[PDB]
């Protein structure tokens, strides 16, 4: 019953906004080898999103500071060295998740829905590494992210309805990968427009349990499009 005790402790941590504790509980749950339920999947997801999100946010702040301190040698070197410290934290977190995904979650995914969720997750966290990589390792990191998303994308178009929030969220994140990581706005826009339009055409497939998530994600897709179509 150690698993159900660890799950309850993780929701205590989330209520307390102690996301390191939350993530450590659900890493322990995952490491017990058994396939996670949807509830456990989501708490593993929420936890690591918050722990990695803190570092991404800090990384962007300090990265912008080190750009704005060009010509001020001592301040820019301090921003750089701090930015590198945050990156080391950011990388260890991503590598922690990517290990769980490859050692436990992907190989145990019995169902199509689980499989595209965890492959989306694999693309997301390689993308966070890509946001921060430079040079040698960046090519391979970009490649891992792309390959995870595509497989997820193909499975989700073959098995899920166009209004399913996991299918829609995957399209949203895949488009942002094309826009932000591969610098291909046309493909990003087309992948987002297509996903939006295929959802609009079958709104009879919305379920009451998930239609709120489905309609929000559709709005986010269209917002990304509106942002990208006024620049490019």
């Amino acid at each position: 019953m150690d698993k159900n005790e660890l799950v309850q402790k993780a929701k205590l941590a989330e209520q307390a906004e102690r996301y390191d504790d939350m993530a450590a509980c659900m890493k322990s749950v995952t490491e017990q080898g058994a396939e996670l339920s949807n509830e456990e999947r989501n708490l593993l997801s929420v936890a690591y999103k918050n722990v990695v999100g803190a570092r991404r946010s800090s990384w962007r702040v300090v990265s912008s500071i080190e750009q704005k301190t060009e010509g001020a040698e001592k301040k820019q070197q301090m921003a750089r060295e701090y930015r590198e410290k945050i990156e080391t934290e950011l990388r260890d977190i991503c590598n922690d998740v990517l290990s769980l995904l490859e050692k436990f979650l992907i190989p145990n995914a019995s169902q199509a829905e689980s499989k595209v969720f965890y492959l989306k997750m694999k693309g997301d966290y390689y993308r966070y590494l890509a946001e921060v990589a430079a040079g040698d390792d960046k090519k391979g990191i970009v490649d891992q992210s792309q390959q995870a998303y595509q497989e997820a994308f193909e499975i989700s178009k073959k098995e899920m309805q166009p209004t399913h929030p996991i299918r829609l969220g995957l399209a949203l994140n895949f488009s942002v990968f094309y826009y932000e990581i591969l610098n291909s706005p046309e493909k990003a826009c087309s992948l987002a427009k297509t996903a939006f339009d295929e959802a609009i055409a079958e709104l009879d497939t919305l379920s009451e349990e998930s239609y709120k998530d489905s309609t929000l994600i559709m709005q986010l897709l269209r917002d990304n499009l509106t942002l990208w179509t006024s620049d490019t």
């Binding site: 997801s45 929420v46 999103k49 918050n50 999100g53 803190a54 991404r56 946010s57 997301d124 929030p165 829609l168 969220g169 949203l172 994140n173 942002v176 826009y179 932000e180 929000l216 994600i217 986010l220 897709l221 917002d223 990304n224 942002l227």
Partner: peptide
């Protein structure tokens, strides 16, 4: 602005 990803709230 920023690119929307989901789930959100970094």
């Amino acid at each position: 602005r920023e690119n929307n990803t989901h789930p959100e709230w970094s």
